[PDB]
Amino acid sequence: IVEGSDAEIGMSPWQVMLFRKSPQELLCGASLISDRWVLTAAHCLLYPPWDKNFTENDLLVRIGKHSRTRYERNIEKISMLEKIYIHPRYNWRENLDRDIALMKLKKPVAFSDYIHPVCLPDRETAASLLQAGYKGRVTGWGNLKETWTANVGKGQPSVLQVVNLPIVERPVCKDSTRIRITDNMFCAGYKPDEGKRGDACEGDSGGPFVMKSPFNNRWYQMGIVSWGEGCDRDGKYGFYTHVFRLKKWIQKVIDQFGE
Amino acid sequence: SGEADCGLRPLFEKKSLEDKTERELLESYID
DNA sequence: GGTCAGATGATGGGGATGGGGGGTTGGAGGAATGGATGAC
Ligand SMILES: *[C@@H]1O[C@H](CO)[C@@H](O[C@@H]2O[C@H](CO)[C@@H](O[C@@H]3O[C@H](CO[C@H]4O[C@H](CO)[C@@H](O)[C@H](O)[C@@H]4O[C@@H]4O[C@H](CO)[C@@H](O[C@@H]5O[C@H](CO[C@]6(C(=O)O)C[C@H](O)[C@@H](NC(C)=O)[C@H]([C@H](O)[C@H](O)CO)O6)[C@H](O)[C@H](O)[C@H]5O)[C@H](O)[C@H]4NC(C)=O)[C@@H](O)[C@H](O[C@H]4O[C@H](CO)[C@@H](O)[C@H](O)[C@@H]4O)[C@@H]3O)[C@H](O)[C@H]2NC(C)=O)[C@H](O)[C@H]1NC(C)=O
Ligand SMILES: *C[C@@](*)(O)[C@H](CCCNC(N)=[NH2+])NC(=O)[C@@H]1CCCN1C(=O)[C@H](N)Cc1ccccc1
Ligand code: NA
Ligand code: NA
16 A cells, blocks of 8 residues: 555455465465355466466465554454455456455454455445545555655554545546456545545555445445556556446356255 | 445544545535 | 684574663563684
8 A cells, every 4th residue: 555554453354365385485465255255356366477386275364453464363364265266357468357256264363353244235325425535445565656666664564554535527537548448447545636645556456445324323434446557657557357247147156056 | 245334443433533535525515 | 824614602682663661562582603723
């Protein structure tokens, strides 16, 4: 997260950290949607152009974390993966269309103050909340800057980062990039003249773009951190997987088998 | 799976406390 | 006269784990080389 701020203890209990077993390395973010289900971006698991293609027993899942790397004793639960499900029309060849994956835990996870799932949105909540100008919230332990280029200031944060960002009209997204956009994605972040900064960076993918409904007072996951071009560049907007446009598929896997 | 109580934070909603930048989102919804 | 190889050496030293001494959680035990020293 670029231009973010340090998360308050348990202000994102659905925040899930996707971790490589060997070598130990943080890969991506994720969100807890159930006691047995975790939602992430497809490209954290499968991106052939970068020779990336993981397996259930390649990865761990750390839940209820604040501190980025060290084991938070008596707080974090580490779960293993029973099964990884990638959207079968995820398009890694072109523009990460349908950047979405589900991950089933072997055991359910005990909920706590630090662990609690986020809601998926229904037709109405989507219609109601996904409008240009409405602010959602992104979170992760991704980069604080573009690290591929020479820069100063630290590379990664030491605790979970939070930033709130406004949704952007599809005409603006469309032409802020030369990458083909899709209805299965939305873009978010301040316009240049709005004189405010913020973005998801590398390492934030799979992280939830959540919004809080003023009706039922519940937090809904509207997006998944998908892609961008640089971090926090002017006239550039973060792109998120559109969770609701893909709920039919989500529901179809989650409810496929009797728990 | 406990999905009937989602979106409600043990340390926030469940205690009628707000996070330090929560209102910022609510105020975005005004237009 | 300057290669070489165990070797003893404080010192800064967790742990699924940093800098500490509680935290969003106990209560203790502590990483992994460095450069002087006979054998030729
Ligand atoms: C990212 O990386 C991955 C690798 O990590 C890579 O994918 C790998 O690479 C190849 C894919 O292109 C592929 O290779 C093949 O492998 C063939 C053999 O594969 C099987 O081998 C062992 C077991 O023998 C397993 O470890 C493998 O996973 C695989 O098993 C099958 O996998 C399929 C596909 O996922 C499964 O089908 C699913 O089944 C579900 C239901 O399942 C059951 C069921 O009914 O309950 C499970 C049961 O156990 C089973 N019955 C029993 C008791 O055995 C039944 C049964 O299969 C049928 O039902 C009865 O007909 O199925 C659902 O249906 C679900 O929808 C479905 O997806 C399934 O678990 C399992 N069964 C099957 C179908 O076999 C080799 O044969 C092949 O070699 C060559 O042989 C050909 C014949 O001679 C030859 O003509 C040809 O030249 C072949 O090359 C080849 O080596 C790898 O297997 C594959 N790995 C994985 C994990 O899929 C990705 O591509 C990569 N991505 C990119 C793009 O980079
Ligand atoms: C996987 C995620 O950590 C990461 C997040 C990027 C978010 N950036 C901003 N500014 N919000 N995603 C990526 O890095 C993806 C996967 C690999 C390519 N990629 C990119 O975003 C590129 N930087 C641009 C791009 C390349 C190919 C296809 C689509 C986009
Ligand atoms: Na920007
Ligand atoms: Na400690």
